[PDB]
Amino acid sequence: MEYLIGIQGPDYVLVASDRVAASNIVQMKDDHDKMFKMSEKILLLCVGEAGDTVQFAEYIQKNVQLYKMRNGYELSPTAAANFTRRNLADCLRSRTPYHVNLLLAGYDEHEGPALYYMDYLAALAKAPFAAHGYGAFLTLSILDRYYTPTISRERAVELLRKCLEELQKRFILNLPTFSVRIIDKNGIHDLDNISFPKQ
Amino acid sequence: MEYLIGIQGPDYVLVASDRVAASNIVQMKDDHDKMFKMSEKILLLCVGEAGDTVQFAEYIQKNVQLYKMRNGYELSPTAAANFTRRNLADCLRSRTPYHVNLLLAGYDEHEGPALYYMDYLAALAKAPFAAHGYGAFLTLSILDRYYTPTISRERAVELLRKCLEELQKRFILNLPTFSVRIIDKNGIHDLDNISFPKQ
Amino acid sequence: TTIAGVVYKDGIVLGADTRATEGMVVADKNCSKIHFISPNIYCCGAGTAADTDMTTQLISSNLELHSLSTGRLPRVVTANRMLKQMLFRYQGYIGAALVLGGVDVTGPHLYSIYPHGSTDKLPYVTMGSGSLAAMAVFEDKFRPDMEEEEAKNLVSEAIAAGIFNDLGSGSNIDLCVISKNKLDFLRPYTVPNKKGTRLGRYRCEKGTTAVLTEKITPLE
Amino acid sequence: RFSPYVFNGGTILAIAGEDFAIVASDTRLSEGFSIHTRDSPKCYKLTDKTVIGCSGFHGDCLTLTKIIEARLKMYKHSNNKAMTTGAIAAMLSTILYSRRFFPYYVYNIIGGLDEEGKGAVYSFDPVGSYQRDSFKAGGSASAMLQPLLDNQVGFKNMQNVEHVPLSLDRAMRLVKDVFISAAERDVYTGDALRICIVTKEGIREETVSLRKD
Amino acid sequence: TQNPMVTGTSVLGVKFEGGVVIAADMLGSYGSLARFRNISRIMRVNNSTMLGASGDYADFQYLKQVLGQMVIDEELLGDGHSYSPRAIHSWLTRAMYSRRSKMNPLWNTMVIGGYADGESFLGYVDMLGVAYEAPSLATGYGAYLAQPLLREVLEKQPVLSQTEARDLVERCMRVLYYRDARSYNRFQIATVTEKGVEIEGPLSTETNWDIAHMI
Amino acid sequence: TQNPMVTGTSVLGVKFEGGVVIAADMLGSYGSLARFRNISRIMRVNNSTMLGASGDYADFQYLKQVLGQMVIDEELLGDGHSYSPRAIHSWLTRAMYSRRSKMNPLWNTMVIGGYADGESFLGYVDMLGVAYEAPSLATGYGAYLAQPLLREVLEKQPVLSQTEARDLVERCMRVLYYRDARSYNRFQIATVTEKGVEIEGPLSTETNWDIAHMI
Amino acid sequence: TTTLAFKFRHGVIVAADSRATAGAYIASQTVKKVIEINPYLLGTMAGGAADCSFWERLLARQCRIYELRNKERISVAAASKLLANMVYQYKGMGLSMGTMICGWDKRGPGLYYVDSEGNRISGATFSVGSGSVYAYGVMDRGYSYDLEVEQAYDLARRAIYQATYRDAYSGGAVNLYHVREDGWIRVSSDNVADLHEKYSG
Amino acid sequence: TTIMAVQFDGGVVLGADSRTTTGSYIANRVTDKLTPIHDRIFCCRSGSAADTQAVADAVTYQLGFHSIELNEPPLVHTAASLFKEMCYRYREDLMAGIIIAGWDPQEGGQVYSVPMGGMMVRQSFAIGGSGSSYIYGYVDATYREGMTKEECLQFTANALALAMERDGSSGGVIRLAAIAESGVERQVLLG
Amino acid sequence: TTIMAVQFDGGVVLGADSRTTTGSYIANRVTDKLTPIHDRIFCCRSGSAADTQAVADAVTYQLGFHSIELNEPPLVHTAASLFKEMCYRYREDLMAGIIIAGWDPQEGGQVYSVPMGGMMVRQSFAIGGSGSSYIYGYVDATYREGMTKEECLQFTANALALAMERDGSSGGVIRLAAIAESGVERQVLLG
Amino acid sequence: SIMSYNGGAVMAMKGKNCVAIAADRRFGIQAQMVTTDFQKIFPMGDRLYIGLAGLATDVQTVAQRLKFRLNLYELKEGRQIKPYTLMSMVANLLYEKRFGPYYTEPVIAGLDPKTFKPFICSLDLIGCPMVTDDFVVSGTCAEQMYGMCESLWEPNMDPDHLFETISQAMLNAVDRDAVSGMGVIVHIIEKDKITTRTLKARMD
């Protein structure tokens, strides 16, 4: 229903999102934030059931903040991704099934950048690019077309421009404004809000 | 699903439409035309079932063109609107139910301008403004707010600007470009294509 | 699946095929549907294959625990009482069709156990999908107090009737003879069907397959 | 309630040769878990150069066979000639579509020579689509026979394998081997293997036994 | 017919040297109730062919009415022709298939035994238009019970005499009296030869209950 | 209880001057089958109160077991107290309401007649916890048939003697023998007074069939 | 199943895959999905194979009779109108048909789109199939009206390749036709396994 | 509903109850179950109420028209054939339990049975209805070949009394009919 | 399935068939329907197969433990009370048709009936099972108060033979049991 | 079905003195692939592997629960695990979830930890073991894999022709399947070394 994207580089992770909080037919909030800073080098979006997206991001946030506060250092993005897959798979066979769909985007000091994938059936997948929502059916061709494993981040933003102009050409949705982060050796950096003017 | 509007003036009928031909999740055609010139002073949009919208407009088109070709003069907009209500109400109780939703917009030489309304249950309603689709739930407040029975057509286009800027603010749809006609004592006049730029 | 058993004048003869199907595709050409319980009692299973396997091991574990405590030989009515009480508690959700047979101090005893808990003491039983074919062989050609070689002819005839008439059956025939002292277990007894020879040489030599990336890891 | 359909079984194989056509089928007619008979071939000599196979629901197979046999005679009394191989496949597609909303449950394969003496195999579906192929296998054991002939006849997925045309004698042992392997894993594959060979000189039949389980 | 009210049960049939023997019992049942203890389930078509049936009995009286008329219709021509047992088997197949195609079938299962031109014929007819030929036929639970007894002897010895075949049916009818819940100890045996069609009377079996003392 | 197996039928009751009379029949039915021709459907609680019931009979034996114990429990105290007929009517109401609140009701319909302190009591208890008081009660089809006969006399004359009330029940039990499909010509009449509880024997009615000659 | 069609300065380009499946089982790899109607018209296949094969064959029957009576080839908008009226009579009975109509006309190029749901729209670019959404994105990034002939071949060729690479039901071989003013012409028929080695480097 | 029919040497003996129900309510105390089609041929009807009244009028229409054209007394087997043709043709729409009995000059007394399916069979004694299931054991042991007329009137009286006692559907009053060459005798009993 | 129980002066007489079915297939030709709980108290079981075998083991467990603690022969009414407590408590999960009969020193022969509901009643003769519906009329007219033992063995033999003949569910062979003060006599008949 | 949600195929084959196992590489959701590097073969000690197919949740779940119990077994005892011991261990772990079952079908291949003796088996989703002597298969495209190995397997085969037989068995069966593909990895292990190769398959 809402769209995310996962361009992975050689030493950087380029993630983007949308800012639309949907409703019945109307658009209540148009500057929503799907992002959740877990640590200094690990981000977390979320897509899924409207009550479930908030609390599981809040639940995974604190348990990772326990690890840094007790042991004095940060989780790796690999160990962080495999802690999330445990909690969804355990309480899947339960009276309260869980329904969210989101990866991780992390930078390791030893292993460099990394990108994962997650379904609501809790399956992990190391991937060089990924997407969710219905826009994945219209953008995984372009991002497969114009891809290079040794791409630069200036081309990657320009590649993200190509991925986003096909969104507001053949959709039945609105999706005006898109928020973008970037993760490197120096941590979380906020790029500008990618938007499309109306007039 | 798609949006129409029916601003009625003292001596003019201002109608507008959209140009989007929808699909599953994609937008196949973005310069569609819902309009059907029945005669020199009677127009006809259509909204409904994807197979039914074309043929009933084609069926009502020819039977009105028979009347002008046999008797040598045009139907009134009142007699034209009541011919359409007969054909939907007759074949409603049938093995092939009919599912479309559209009024008429006509100018009489004696009675002046006129605007009707139609449901898929075939009910007529003389109205001073009307709308269909889900956008009627977000525009019948503004058009009730800034209305005057003695409004001028320059204000009416400006009123149509106010009606359309609230569309691309709180929707879950795209709807970029809107086609506009105007009917007067001189017949059908085509105004410019109202659009909203992307960049 | 076709299992059967009979009580002759000195012991009990059991038999089955070795086909285990899956859907409509033969999954196992040589299965094993005769199980160990005690040195005098065996059991044949039918129905859900994992439900018969996990049940027949628990009772055989309990009777080994029971007989080693008593220091004696188990009785067939003990194994009957455990199975009809366990399967009744699970309300028939565990689908296990069983044939229970053994020789006690009291002599030979044969039982049939249905997956709800109903049990029957009979001189001869059939269970399984092709059980109707083997039962027609029994009623046509039964007589009481047969000998051992007459009974081994009868069961191997009845199991073969379910082979050539039922789709779910058809493989090599198992037998077992349990008597007062002798215990015989025959994993092949009669091979009714073979596989035809391969006529065409289909082998292309080494190098006819494209390989992208190889990797070698030595061991010790 | 009264359900009008049931599955019977059978497996049909056709191979388009260079100047021949081989049609093979088993003879088991089963229903549910039981065997009705062990002698029920699926081969039907339509003309001197065309053999059809029919699988699926057996009541529709007997009906659909007798419809085609009438229209062959209706062609000949109206046109003073016999139908070709492709003309029968074009006629059959309209017959299968003619009951679009109450369909036959029948998988059809037509093999035979063309008007130039080459093997032609036309596969079908229960609604009416068709195409010309080099080899098809239809019926219950259709999934166990298609990928093997891709390796042998199609010569796919092999490096440095030459493309020799399939001879007549090499094609005979290819048919006799695949039904042995199909009879091991399928429960519907029966006992007698009726093999019809359509050449430019007539139609030869041949029966090979399988395992009787 | 959507619901069979009064039903029959298994019908047996097997070829022998110069003829076909067919046996069935004489019971009509309404559910678990054995309501009609004395009915006939075998129709003697004219001289060389013969019919027995299972399933709904009210539909069987309908086909008894129709087939009875068609045999009279050719005899009144008097041209020296008759219906072969294969032609009746071909006719009855098209009757079933056209009936089920209108979603209103005839709840039966019919066995046709015939002997013409020195050729024993034995044909099967299903409700769903399934038809074939076999040296031995069985309907209902007899296809599960008596059919393994029929095929075992015939695959050992292909041909049979008349006395061998007649005794073998009485053994199979005995077994069906034990294991079928809706059988009855009163049956009749009908046999075609080159001399014509002959139907025997209400015969019965002899059971064995010596295993009842074994607890 | 989700399915009543063996059921009773209509139970009548009406007050009079110094007592309550209650009558019911002696039949237990399993569907249309009149299986148990001889059962008792009236329990004599200790000295001043009295119970009859309709609905499922196996549930009635359960409440016969429980109420029988509670009366013994107070008599063993011996403090000079007893349960009033209203207190049993109050107790039995809470038993029904708590039972239906667990979605597992007791399929009954109970009538309590009592006479204590010179006061005739007549109480109703439904399966759904509906309870009230009335000068005349009727369950089942008796609420459709005998209840118009009861209210017609009582609204004309409010009080009744014992012989007037006893004869009027026999007229209503006669009418229920005609028009109820699941009634029986064998009933018993139970009556409380100040002298105690007395239950009469298996009485019967006298029908009239003179209209059968009228075609 | 993945088809696409687009018109430009030099006519219309039509491309499609060749795989037809049955549930999770692949029936064949060599299905000719672009149904050749005339020397001047082309039709596609979408969803129901026998439904698209029958009615387009029936559509060719009416176009031939129209030419014999009127001494003129039929127009592209005419043939799309006849097909929409025939399928509408069986509406709600479960027909699967989402084909396209291509051909040259006196008014220039012709491209229409007919569904089994009564849809009949014109346009410039289309993509039909289960893997159609993978073809819209790569084509619209590379589409222009002023393209060359060799340029328009390689755009439509890779666009089918990117669809079959992502989709499971699409695959096989890539057929490619070119509709010109005189009539259509077959361009090529390439295997996906051969294109994979081409676009790897 | 319980119907009864026993033939004897001279003719037949019919019998039925009188109770007509709806749900658990007696719609009618006394009801003529047996129906005079012809002067020598009766039938007793069971199953649906409105169906069996409509079928019995049409057979009386057809047999009455046919017998005058015969100028002959009709056969009992002829009348039972007409119920078979209607009940088999409309077996999807009817619930009829007809038993046809009556004396015939050619063949004496005859009893036929047409159950809900639409078949036809001749019997020595026929019972039907919902309450007929309770007297299968009594009617087998008590029946003896070679009864007089008065034994058959005693035979059917005890048979219907046991069904009325045990069944909740059957009851009311006992109606009898004795058809012979001499005439038709009808009576109403109790006990 | 047809079970039979008749008391007399000295004791009781039991009887049942032997046929055990599943659908329309005979799972077992001969079957002990009657069950020896105690040396003087039997029961004949009906309804489900696995349920009634499980209930009869638990009552034999409880009554056997209680009677040794009594150091007394148990009462027949005591044993019939134990079936009532189990069948009423688990009436949502069981289909049991138990008839309890047996001789008692305090009271002589007794026959109790516990149907599928869970109630209990004492009768002079009790029948049950699926085939018991066909012999309601026969058992009412034939029964006479004040029989000997040999008349009751004749009475139950004809009663089960009529049910076995008419019912498709019942059949097989006839097993009988006669419980008195002297002992228990068991036999197997035909006819 | 639930098994056909992600798809997959696992094949093992016994040779003369060596054993081989292979699987595909595609990870997808019902029409749409995601990646080509989803691991389905997991090492359990040396000269002994295991393959998993079915629902990708239970693939990653059971392979970690089995690894949980395996390291506890090899530390309480000093030795490694025998292949029969592992088959009884997996059949226990699936039968515990008798009514809430895991949707996977394991395949075990390996050698004797004492000799060169190979071992193959496969299990149901509830835990019925099944040992053979030639091959075991699992996954959605099961019937295509039976048609290969019944027509290509020979009893006594060197490690070269064993590699060539299991390669042609996978490349012809998986390309006939729709939801499985995108590369095949092949493990061929023996007494002295472990060889892992990746084949050149159709990427469509």
Side-chain angles (χ1 to χ4, degrees), chain D residues 39-44 46-56:
Chain D
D39 193 1
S40 178
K42 277 79 175 175
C43 297
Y44 295 102
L46 296 176
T47 64
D48 292 331
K49 294 186 288 184
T50 298
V51 173
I52 192 168
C54 298
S55 178

mmCIF file of all heavy atoms in Angstrom, chain D residues 39-56, unseen atoms left out:
data_model
loop_
_atom_site.group_PDB
_atom_site.id
_atom_site.type_symbol
_atom_site.label_atom_id
_atom_site.label_comp_id
_atom_site.label_asym_id
_atom_site.label_seq_id
_atom_site.Cartn_x
_atom_site.Cartn_y
_atom_site.Cartn_z
ATOM 1 N N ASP D 39 -7.299 -54.405 -20.067
ATOM 2 C CA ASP D 39 -7.228 -54.376 -21.525
ATOM 3 C C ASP D 39 -8.137 -53.246 -21.993
ATOM 4 O O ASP D 39 -9.337 -53.444 -22.193
ATOM 5 C CB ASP D 39 -7.639 -55.715 -22.121
ATOM 6 C CG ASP D 39 -7.289 -55.836 -23.593
ATOM 7 O OD1 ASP D 39 -6.699 -54.892 -24.159
ATOM 8 O OD2 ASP D 39 -7.609 -56.884 -24.190
ATOM 9 N N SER D 40 -7.559 -52.063 -22.172
ATOM 10 C CA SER D 40 -8.302 -50.895 -22.643
ATOM 11 C C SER D 40 -7.333 -49.946 -23.320
ATOM 12 O O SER D 40 -6.829 -48.999 -22.706
ATOM 13 C CB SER D 40 -9.030 -50.200 -21.495
ATOM 14 O OG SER D 40 -9.700 -49.042 -21.954
ATOM 15 N N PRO D 41 -7.043 -50.169 -24.600
ATOM 16 C CA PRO D 41 -6.098 -49.298 -25.298
ATOM 17 C C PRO D 41 -6.710 -47.942 -25.596
ATOM 18 O O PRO D 41 -7.929 -47.787 -25.691
ATOM 19 C CB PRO D 41 -5.799 -50.066 -26.588
ATOM 20 C CG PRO D 41 -7.029 -50.855 -26.827
ATOM 21 C CD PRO D 41 -7.548 -51.243 -25.471
ATOM 22 N N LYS D 42 -5.840 -46.948 -25.734
ATOM 23 C CA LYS D 42 -6.253 -45.588 -26.035
ATOM 24 C C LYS D 42 -5.938 -45.191 -27.468
ATOM 25 O O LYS D 42 -6.151 -44.035 -27.841
ATOM 26 C CB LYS D 42 -5.596 -44.602 -25.067
ATOM 27 C CG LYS D 42 -6.289 -44.446 -23.717
ATOM 28 C CD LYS D 42 -5.978 -45.566 -22.739
ATOM 29 C CE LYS D 42 -6.604 -45.297 -21.386
ATOM 30 N NZ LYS D 42 -6.413 -46.437 -20.451
ATOM 31 N N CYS D 43 -5.433 -46.117 -28.273
ATOM 32 C CA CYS D 43 -5.139 -45.837 -29.668
ATOM 33 C C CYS D 43 -6.399 -45.992 -30.504
ATOM 34 O O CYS D 43 -7.214 -46.885 -30.264
ATOM 35 C CB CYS D 43 -4.052 -46.779 -30.177
ATOM 36 S SG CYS D 43 -2.467 -46.594 -29.340
ATOM 37 N N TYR D 44 -6.561 -45.113 -31.490
ATOM 38 C CA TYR D 44 -7.713 -45.159 -32.384
ATOM 39 C C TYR D 44 -7.250 -44.786 -33.783
ATOM 40 O O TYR D 44 -6.834 -43.649 -34.016
ATOM 41 C CB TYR D 44 -8.817 -44.215 -31.918
ATOM 42 C CG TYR D 44 -9.427 -44.602 -30.599
ATOM 43 C CD1 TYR D 44 -9.069 -43.946 -29.430
ATOM 44 C CD2 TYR D 44 -10.363 -45.621 -30.522
ATOM 45 C CE1 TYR D 44 -9.626 -44.295 -28.221
ATOM 46 C CE2 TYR D 44 -10.926 -45.978 -29.317
ATOM 47 C CZ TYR D 44 -10.554 -45.311 -28.171
ATOM 48 O OH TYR D 44 -11.114 -45.665 -26.967
ATOM 49 N N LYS D 45 -7.326 -45.733 -34.711
ATOM 50 C CA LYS D 45 -6.945 -45.475 -36.094
ATOM 51 C C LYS D 45 -8.066 -44.700 -36.770
ATOM 52 O O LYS D 45 -9.103 -45.271 -37.116
ATOM 53 C CB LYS D 45 -6.661 -46.782 -36.828
ATOM 54 N N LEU D 46 -7.862 -43.399 -36.960
ATOM 55 C CA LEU D 46 -8.871 -42.586 -37.630
ATOM 56 C C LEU D 46 -8.824 -42.799 -39.135
ATOM 57 O O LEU D 46 -9.798 -43.253 -39.743
ATOM 58 C CB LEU D 46 -8.663 -41.111 -37.293
ATOM 59 C CG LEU D 46 -8.851 -40.757 -35.821
ATOM 60 C CD1 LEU D 46 -8.527 -39.296 -35.590
ATOM 61 C CD2 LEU D 46 -10.262 -41.077 -35.374
ATOM 62 N N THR D 47 -7.697 -42.476 -39.749
ATOM 63 C CA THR D 47 -7.442 -42.753 -41.151
ATOM 64 C C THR D 47 -6.251 -43.696 -41.238
ATOM 65 O O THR D 47 -5.784 -44.236 -40.233
ATOM 66 C CB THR D 47 -7.175 -41.470 -41.938
ATOM 67 O OG1 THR D 47 -5.977 -40.857 -41.452
ATOM 68 C CG2 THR D 47 -8.331 -40.500 -41.791
ATOM 69 N N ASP D 48 -5.755 -43.891 -42.456
ATOM 70 C CA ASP D 48 -4.541 -44.672 -42.639
ATOM 71 C C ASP D 48 -3.288 -43.923 -42.213
ATOM 72 O O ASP D 48 -2.220 -44.536 -42.144
ATOM 73 C CB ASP D 48 -4.414 -45.094 -44.098
ATOM 74 C CG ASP D 48 -5.475 -46.088 -44.503
ATOM 75 O OD1 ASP D 48 -5.933 -46.853 -43.630
ATOM 76 O OD2 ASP D 48 -5.856 -46.102 -45.691
ATOM 77 N N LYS D 49 -3.383 -42.620 -41.936
ATOM 78 C CA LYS D 49 -2.221 -41.819 -41.575
ATOM 79 C C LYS D 49 -2.457 -40.981 -40.325
ATOM 80 O O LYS D 49 -1.749 -39.994 -40.115
ATOM 81 C CB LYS D 49 -1.819 -40.904 -42.732
ATOM 82 C CG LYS D 49 -1.319 -41.624 -43.963
ATOM 83 C CD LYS D 49 -0.817 -40.631 -44.984
ATOM 84 C CE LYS D 49 -1.970 -39.886 -45.623
ATOM 85 N NZ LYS D 49 -1.496 -38.967 -46.687
ATOM 86 N N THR D 50 -3.435 -41.334 -39.495
ATOM 87 C CA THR D 50 -3.749 -40.520 -38.326
ATOM 88 C C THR D 50 -4.260 -41.404 -37.200
ATOM 89 O O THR D 50 -5.220 -42.156 -37.387
ATOM 90 C CB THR D 50 -4.790 -39.447 -38.662
ATOM 91 O OG1 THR D 50 -4.269 -38.566 -39.665
ATOM 92 C CG2 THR D 50 -5.144 -38.637 -37.430
ATOM 93 N N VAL D 51 -3.616 -41.307 -36.040
ATOM 94 C CA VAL D 51 -4.010 -42.023 -34.834
ATOM 95 C C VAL D 51 -4.197 -40.999 -33.724
ATOM 96 O O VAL D 51 -3.341 -40.131 -33.525
ATOM 97 C CB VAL D 51 -2.963 -43.083 -34.442
ATOM 98 C CG1 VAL D 51 -3.292 -43.715 -33.103
ATOM 99 C CG2 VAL D 51 -2.884 -44.158 -35.503
ATOM 100 N N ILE D 52 -5.317 -41.090 -33.014
ATOM 101 C CA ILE D 52 -5.629 -40.182 -31.920
ATOM 102 C C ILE D 52 -5.559 -40.952 -30.606
ATOM 103 O O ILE D 52 -5.783 -42.167 -30.557
ATOM 104 C CB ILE D 52 -7.011 -39.522 -32.144
ATOM 105 C CG1 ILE D 52 -7.251 -38.348 -31.194
ATOM 106 C CG2 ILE D 52 -8.140 -40.530 -32.041
ATOM 107 C CD1 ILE D 52 -8.441 -37.515 -31.562
ATOM 108 N N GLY D 53 -5.181 -40.250 -29.548
ATOM 109 C CA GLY D 53 -5.240 -40.783 -28.196
ATOM 110 C C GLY D 53 -6.137 -39.916 -27.337
ATOM 111 O O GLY D 53 -6.151 -38.693 -27.481
ATOM 112 N N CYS D 54 -6.884 -40.556 -26.441
ATOM 113 C CA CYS D 54 -7.845 -39.869 -25.590
ATOM 114 C C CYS D 54 -7.693 -40.364 -24.163
ATOM 115 O O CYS D 54 -7.817 -41.563 -23.907
ATOM 116 C CB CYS D 54 -9.276 -40.113 -26.073
ATOM 117 S SG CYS D 54 -9.635 -39.494 -27.728
ATOM 118 N N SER D 55 -7.436 -39.445 -23.235
ATOM 119 C CA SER D 55 -7.314 -39.775 -21.822
ATOM 120 C C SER D 55 -8.356 -39.003 -21.030
ATOM 121 O O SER D 55 -9.175 -38.269 -21.586
ATOM 122 C CB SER D 55 -5.913 -39.465 -21.290
ATOM 123 O OG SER D 55 -5.836 -39.741 -19.904
ATOM 124 N N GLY D 56 -8.314 -39.166 -19.712
ATOM 125 C CA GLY D 56 -9.217 -38.442 -18.842
ATOM 126 C C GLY D 56 -10.478 -39.211 -18.518
ATOM 127 O O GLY D 56 -10.428 -40.415 -18.257
#
